[PDB]
Amino acid sequence: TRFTEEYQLFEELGKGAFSVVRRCVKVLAGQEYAAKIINTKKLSARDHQKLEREARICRLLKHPNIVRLHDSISEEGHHYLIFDLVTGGELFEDIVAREYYSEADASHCIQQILEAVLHCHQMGVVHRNLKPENLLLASKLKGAAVKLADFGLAIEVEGEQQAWFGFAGTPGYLSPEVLRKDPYGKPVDLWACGVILYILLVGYPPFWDEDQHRLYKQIKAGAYDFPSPEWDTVTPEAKDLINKMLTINPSKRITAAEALKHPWISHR
């Protein structure tokens, strides 16, 4: 088939799920890509379908701050999704490395994140699993680009129509509406931007507990705050944005487009 003809593998970049990621090159073009190789003799009928939901969505999304999918290929034994190569590692690791970001940096990172989210939403796509692990950095340089990945959890919404699309995502990043098993829509990803922006600033999330139940109780209640001495020095504006992102009521929450106009994003 068409993949083993046109591309040529090199080093493993990642493991996780049944999915091995490896650097590759189109032998005509000379152009490097990231290839997500999925073992398929290990995978059911509907989970060949769940994976083709994923391709179909990556294809709807052309953005500077979204990992572009360049071509999906079903060979007998394996599937290859062919992504933009992005070497900067996870934002997660970069936060850990640097402990926290400057407001200047956080502002420049979340800006790119929100722009992507905005685009995702206008295309009727809700990520549902935003977190610094699903955010890849272009290079490690102290400002470089940030792109979204793992639409493996991503849903299609018709308009601002809310609905129960089920209970999925990462515990820390879950919205109050999702935990309550209420209907939900685009805003569940601005909650995640809340968590992420908070992390981006001070090195730890606004909600945590080793006992999962206590965690889900913290989220529902919207029980975060700004501990001293770290938040003592952080602009009232920054806090404000986080407060409008971590609003419990989805309707009263800030939207991606709103968040991009907020003073801590556009100054001068």
Binding site: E99, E133, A168, T170, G172, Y173, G203, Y204, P227
Partner: peptide, 19 residues
């Protein structure tokens, strides 16, 4: 268990799986 210090809080930052 976390102290009441920035650096102790910063250990709450853990990778988390989906579901």
């Amino acid at each position: 268990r976390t102290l009441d210090s920035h650096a102790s809080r910063m250990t709450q930052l853990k990778k988390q799986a989906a579901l």
